[PDB]
Structures are given as C-alpha cells and as structure tokens.
Amino acid sequence: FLTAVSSIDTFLPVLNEAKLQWPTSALAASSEELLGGYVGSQFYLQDGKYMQFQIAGSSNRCELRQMIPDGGSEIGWAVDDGTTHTATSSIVVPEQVDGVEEVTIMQIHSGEAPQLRISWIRSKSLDGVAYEDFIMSTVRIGTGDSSDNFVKTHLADRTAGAMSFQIDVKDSKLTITVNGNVVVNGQDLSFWDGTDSCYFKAGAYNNNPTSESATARIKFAALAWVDHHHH
Ligand SMILES: O=C(O)[C@H]1O[C@@H](O[C@H]2[C@H](O)[C@H](O)[C@@H](O)O[C@@H]2C(=O)O)[C@@H](O)[C@@H](O)[C@@H]1O
Numbered sequence: 745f746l747t748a749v750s751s752i753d754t755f756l757p758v759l760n761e762a763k764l765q766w767p768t769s770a771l772a773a774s775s776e777e778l779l780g781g782y783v784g785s786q787f788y789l790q791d792g793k794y795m796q797f798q799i800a801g802s803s804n805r806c807e808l809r810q811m812i813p814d815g816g817s818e819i820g821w822a823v824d825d826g827t828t829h830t831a832t833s834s835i836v837v838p839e840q841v842d843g844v845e846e847v848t849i850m851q852i853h854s855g856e857a858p859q860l861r862i863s864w865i866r867s868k869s870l871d872g873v874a875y876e877d878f879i880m881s882t883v884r885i886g887t888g889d890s891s892d893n894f895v896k897t898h899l900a901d902r903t904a905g906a907m908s909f910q911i912d913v914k915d916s917k918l919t920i921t922v923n924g925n926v927v928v929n930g931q932d933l934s935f936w937d938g939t940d941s942c943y944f945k946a947g948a949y950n951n952n953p954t955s956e957s958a959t960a961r962i963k964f965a966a967l968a969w970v971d972h973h974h975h
C-alpha cells in the first residue's frame with residue numbers, strides 16, 4: 745500500500761498551507777485532506793522521507809499551491825507589498841524517463857502568469873551556451889512571447905543527491921539561492937508591481953513533453969513557505 749505524505753512530521757507545516765492540484769489545476773486535495781492522509785500514486789511518501797509527485801501529460805501537474813494557513817482560502821500577495829516572501833525546498837530530481845523534457849518544480853505564479861519557474865530541463869541553449877540535464881530559472885519581465893519578456897538562467901546541473909533551493913521576494917526584487925549560494929541576485933520584478941494575486945507553488949508541472957504517457961517524477965526532502973512576520 746502507498747504510504748501517505750502526512751504520516752511523518754516533515755511536511756505538515758506546508759501541507760497546512762497548501763492545496764494539491766492534480767492532474768490539472770483542478771483541486772485534488774484540500775489542505776485538510778492532505779493533513780488527513782490523502783494519498784495516491786501521484787502524491788505519496790517515497791523511502792519513508794520524500795514527498796514524491798508524479799504526473800504525465802503535456803501541461804498536466806501534481807503541484808501544491810500556497811493557501812492561507814489553517815484551512816484558509818487561496819493566498820495572494822504582491823512583490824511590492826514590502827514583506828519578504830520566502831519558499832524553501834530540498835529536492836531530489838531523479839533521472840527522468842524518455843519523453844519528459846521539462847518539469848517545473850517551484851513557481852511564483854499569479855492569477856494570469858508565472859513570474860518565476862524553477863524547472864529541470866533535458867536540453868536547452870541559453871545566451872549561446874548549450875546545457876543538458878540542468879535546473880533553470882525562467883523569470884517573466886513582461887507578458888509577451890518574445891525573448892525580451894524573459895530572463896533565463898542556468899542555476900545548477902542536476903545532482904543525484906538533494907539540492908536545496910530558496911526563493912526570496914522583497915521590494916520588487918527576486919533572489920534565488922541554490923545549495924547555499926546566491927545564483928540570482930536581486931532580479932527586477934517591478935513589472936509586477938501592484939499585482940496582488942501572487943503565490944508560491946511546488947511539485948511537478950510537466951512542460952513540452954514529447955510523449956504524453958511519460959511520467960515525470962520529483963522527490964521533495966523538504967518544502968516550506970517561511971513567514972517573516974510569525975503570525
Ligand atoms: O516555448 C517555450 O518552451 C517557452 O515556454 C515558456 O514557458 C511556458 C511554459 O513552457 C509553460 O507553457 C507555462 O508555464 O507557460 C510558460 C510561459 O508562457 O511563460 C518560457 O520558458 C519561454 O522561455 C519558452 O520560450
């Protein structure tokens with residue numbers, strides 16, 4: 745039988761502040777249901793320690809979406825509200841099966857757009873350099889489709905072992921720290937000033953696969969939204 749993520753203590757804080765969306769953005773499990781032992785092949789405890797997400801299909805997901813804590817509704821915050829918004833994780837990205845090409849593992853998203861995607865990607869060239877099997881950040885600085893709307897950065901080559909991430913937003917600036925080192929230092933998010941619908945996400949969101957039956961799989965050793973105001 746499949747062991748439930750809530751059977752250990754590690755993820756209870758974030759489960760109390762998230763809903764699970766699967767296999768689309770449709771609700772799969774409320775925060776209460778997650779804390780109550782919701783489990784399936786898409787979302788279960790692997791190795792007695794990892795919150796594991798699995799999903800197949802282009803643009804499908806198995807993803808946590810930040811909620812107001814203690815049974816609250818969907819959160820919305822703004823890059824320019826003056827508060828520091830922080831998400832931390834420790835992630836084991838396994839080798840992905842053929843047909844999986846890009847898997848978004850953390851986001852800042854709003855009602856209409858992804859401000860930030862951290863994604864594993866099989867192969868991509870950035871600024872004239874080819875990279876394989878790596879973790880990328882994609883920041884939107886506009887809503888258009890041309891390259892001037894994005895800042896894309898190689899964060900790290902994929903490691904077999906756990907990799908730590910931290911996302912911080914304060915005063916319209918974004919910092920991404922990977923394995924303790926700052927890789928994105930104060931990226932401008934001021935295009936999004938006044939958008940009050942931002943929230944964190946984490947899990948597996950499957951982008952541009954070449955087979956819709958190929959199952960993406962991501963293991964979280966830790967995940968939290970860190971509240972700088974201590975409510
Ligand atoms: O053609 C691309 O791969 C294009 O995708 C962009 O990311 C999109 C994702 O693939 C998903 O469709 C979803 O998350 O929307 C994203 C978006 O529209 O921002 C960027 O990665 C872009 O650089 C790239 O050209």
Ligand SMILES: O=C(O)[C@H]1O[C@@H](O[C@H]2[C@H](O)[C@H](O)[C@H](O)O[C@H]2C(=O)O)[C@@H](O)[C@@H](O)[C@@H]1O
Nearest residue numbers: 765768769770771809818853854855857945
């Ligand atoms: O699937 C999408 O295109 C986006 O869905 C978003 O979730 C919202 C959506 O209205 C859902 O049907 C449900 O109501 O939850 C909403 C929400 O939590 O904001 C996000 O999952 C977004 O990341 C997707 O891009």
